[PDB]
Design an enzyme around this catalytic site. Structure first.
Site, PDB file in Angstrom:
ATOM      1  N   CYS A 146       0.809  -1.217   0.000  1.00  0.00           N
ATOM      2  CA  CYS A 146       0.000   0.000   0.000  1.00  0.00           C
ATOM      3  C   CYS A 146       0.842   1.266   0.000  1.00  0.00           C
ATOM      4  O   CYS A 146       0.360   2.321  -0.426  1.00  0.00           O
ATOM      5  CB  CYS A 146      -0.929   0.016   1.217  1.00  0.00           C
ATOM      6  SG  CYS A 146      -2.374  -1.066   1.102  1.00  0.00           S
TER       7      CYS A 146
HETATM    8  C1  LIG Z   1      -2.367  -9.809  -8.817  1.00  0.00           C
HETATM    9  C2  LIG Z   1      -2.686  -8.956  -7.593  1.00  0.00           C
HETATM   10  C3  LIG Z   1      -2.597  -9.816  -6.335  1.00  0.00           C
HETATM   11  C4  LIG Z   1      -3.521  -9.248  -5.258  1.00  0.00           C
HETATM   12  C5  LIG Z   1      -2.978  -7.912  -4.755  1.00  0.00           C
HETATM   13  C6  LIG Z   1      -3.605  -7.589  -3.401  1.00  0.00           C
HETATM   14  C7  LIG Z   1      -4.167  -6.168  -3.424  1.00  0.00           C
HETATM   15  C8  LIG Z   1      -4.701  -5.795  -2.041  1.00  0.00           C
HETATM   16  C9  LIG Z   1      -3.696  -4.888  -1.329  1.00  0.00           C
HETATM   17  C10 LIG Z   1      -3.244  -5.509  -0.007  1.00  0.00           C
HETATM   18  C11 LIG Z   1      -2.078  -6.477  -0.221  1.00  0.00           C
HETATM   19  C12 LIG Z   1      -1.020  -6.288   0.871  1.00  0.00           C
HETATM   20  O1  LIG Z   1      -1.099  -6.888   1.887  1.00  0.00           O
HETATM   21  C13 LIG Z   1       0.141  -5.319   0.676  1.00  0.00           C
HETATM   22  C14 LIG Z   1      -0.355  -3.900   0.937  1.00  0.00           C
HETATM   23  O2  LIG Z   1      -0.182  -3.389   1.990  1.00  0.00           O
END
Ligand SMILES: CCCCCCCCCCCC(=O)CC=O
Lengths: 373, 371
Positions: free
Chosen positions: A140
């Site tokens: 994020c």
């Molecule tokens: C191909 C896409 C794969 C999925 C992506 C996930 C999108 C959601 C954001 C949260 C993921 C995380 O934990 C790191 C952020 O802090």
């Protein structure tokens, strides 16, 4: 210093109201006969303060999901499409030729080897010697993280122009990972109550994250587009809170991906936010009360409240964080670029006014960027 | 300009002779009754000219692979261990405290969110405000790519010191991915004759790639360690060959490594435009170069670079020796080779060197060095 010249965003075609998305998850629970209180789905889909979200990937995959590789291919293709649209809009609005871009920096969690920025080189006529900065492992925080890394590069290249884009496809989690995990956790719940917090975290993930792309054009001090009306990156700083890796991140698991977002993030945020921001502001002889504008990534409504409380902010100072969350949800690394795009369409910021970009992500890491108009 | 001060490497505990690895794959074919010429495995394990490889992940469980969740965790943990060892050796041999490093750059295909460099600050007492440069999506180019990006940063920060590390766990593909793909591909060979080339590429993947880690300490010109006689990074350049995405990369499916036979031929479209353009802009020719440090993508890649630049048969010997010693350890390979040069060879004063690597995209990277 570095000048932020312009921004752009790109979103997929399908915008779903949050009520529709909650009903989609409720139906999955109901058709699957999962013994869990449906009111917790409504509770957390409501309490995240999101009105609707863009999903690039299908909603009907909830009931019957496609294969891993098909979803991976779709996420990769959608990420490229959104990034290309955002970059093309950015170049058109600034009348900048792609061959005159020196560096293309990217942040995305979509698996891509080669990176997205390399693939885009076959869709947009960048020169074949384009410098690339493909970043990952930041989650994020990647939007603010990328701005800092590009600004550090342009410190040594005052004549150059760089593009940064952030794109995330959170709807990939709805393609089988959330379904498999929630089913297993709920069915194993009767034999050990310790899994209750795990089900809640997956519900919060389903409630919070969305799809989107933002892009930013940044140039050095000597570039023709460095004009006095634009925000300048004058400093930036990173901070990593020790022993908080397990609090937030994206793990590869048997069920696919699993988003990690523990409730103790809000309290670990406090351990890093003020040392990061107080030190950055003091080293630039700025007090936080004199900041004209805050641009804070909305990891959640609780995160916004925590930032507001920690710095004693009036409760409209972070209103842009709440409005963004309502409009598009948490689009991860792209969110602060979307918010910066909103700011650049507000009225001309008073000259010499100071701004702060603040983001939080896996780590547990925080990023702070000091801006001056 | 920017100075390369020191290098280090780190490898797992288990070194496997190439014949042992070839025997293990044959045992898989034999037990699963896969109808395919067993001597195809032997020729490709032999013709890559590799004497042995380090595998961080186990070879015992080849016939009974563990879950993909525990394989990723093991690969993550092994990646962290190798990076911590390499960085610690680098800091100790240079007598540099972690708190005096401004930037930590990383390249790795190991899934890590948060990145490996972030997780390492809980093992090494870096300052909490450490700047990080976690890169991915570059594959075998990563080590050379990381040197260029750190050099560009240090151009703006002449007083600062930075660490780059590259680590890859190629043995992750032996935890189920190669087993599943080769089985299905061989079964469909009678029905689909065109699947033969796909089996070959997976066998080449099993013969070629290995595990390891390399690290480099780099400083700006104003840093106290920036002493004469160390290699200077005077310039660098990138090149991406148009419309070659499908020739090399790593796909999620577990994983499948993509390495098409057309890779070596596609390199010719980028190598000379990249290198000759970089050297001309620095007022030297390739014939001025005293030392080449070329990533050994394979025996065919080394030969192609040799022919394109009219080099003698021993100019790229370091690429062949490295391949024999540790195999293709992906982004870490050029760092291992640079470590050999700085630690074991004499570099004449004011001589020129060139680091060259190629990876997915298709992309190539060149770094011009001067002693
Ligand atoms: C191909 C896409 C794969 C999925 C992506 C996930 C999108 C959601 C954001 C949260 C993921 C995380 O934990 C790191 C952020 O802090």
């Amino acid at each position: 210093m570095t000048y932020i010249v312009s921004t752009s965003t790109a979103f997929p075609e399908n915008y779903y109201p949050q009520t529709v998305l909650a009903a989609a998850l409720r139906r999955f629970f109901t058709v699957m006969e999962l013994d869990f209180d449906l009111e917790q789905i409504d509770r957390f889909f409501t309490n995240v303060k999101i009105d609707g979200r863009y999903f690039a990937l299908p909603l009907d995959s909830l009931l019957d999901p496609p294969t891993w590789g098909v979803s991976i291919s779709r996420g990769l293709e959608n990420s490229l499409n959104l990034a290309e649209t955002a970059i093309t809009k950015l170049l058109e609005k600034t009348n900048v030729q792609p061959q005159d871009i020196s560096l293309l920096a990217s942040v995305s969690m979509t698996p891509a080897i080669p990176s997205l920025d390399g693939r885009l080189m076959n869709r947009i006529p960048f020169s074949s010697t384009l410098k690339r900065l493909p970043m990952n492992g930041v989650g994020c925080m990647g939007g603010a993280f990328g701005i800092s890394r590009v600004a550090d590069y342009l410190k040594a290249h005052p004549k150059e122009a760089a593009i940064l884009f952030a794109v995330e496809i959170s709807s990939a989690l709805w393609q089988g990972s959330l379904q498999a995990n929630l089913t297993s956790l709920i069915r194993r719940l009767p034999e050990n109550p310790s899994l209750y917090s795990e089900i809640i975290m997956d519900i919060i993930t389903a409630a919070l994250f969305a799809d989107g792309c933002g892009a930013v054009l940044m140039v050095g001090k000597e570039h023709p587009l460095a004009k006095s009306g634009l925000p300048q990156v004058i400093d930036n700083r990173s901070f990593l809170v020790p022993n908080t890796v397990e609090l937030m991140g994206l793990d590869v698991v048997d069920n696919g991906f699993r988003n990690i977002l523990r409730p103790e993030v809000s309290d670990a945020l406090k351990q890093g936010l003020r040392p990061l921001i107080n030190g950055l502001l003091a080293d630039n002889n700025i007090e936080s009360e004199n900041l004209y504008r805050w641009i804070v990534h909305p990891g959640g409504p609780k995160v916004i409240d925590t930032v507001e409380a920690e710095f004693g902010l009036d409760s409209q100072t972070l209103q842009l964080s709440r409005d963004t969350l309502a409009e598009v949800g948490n689009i991860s690394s792209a969110t602060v670029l979307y918010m910066l795009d909103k700011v650049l369409s507000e009225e001309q910021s008073p000259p010499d006014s100071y701004g702060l970009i603040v983001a939080m992500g896996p780590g547990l890491a925080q990023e702070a960027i000091l801006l001056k108009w």
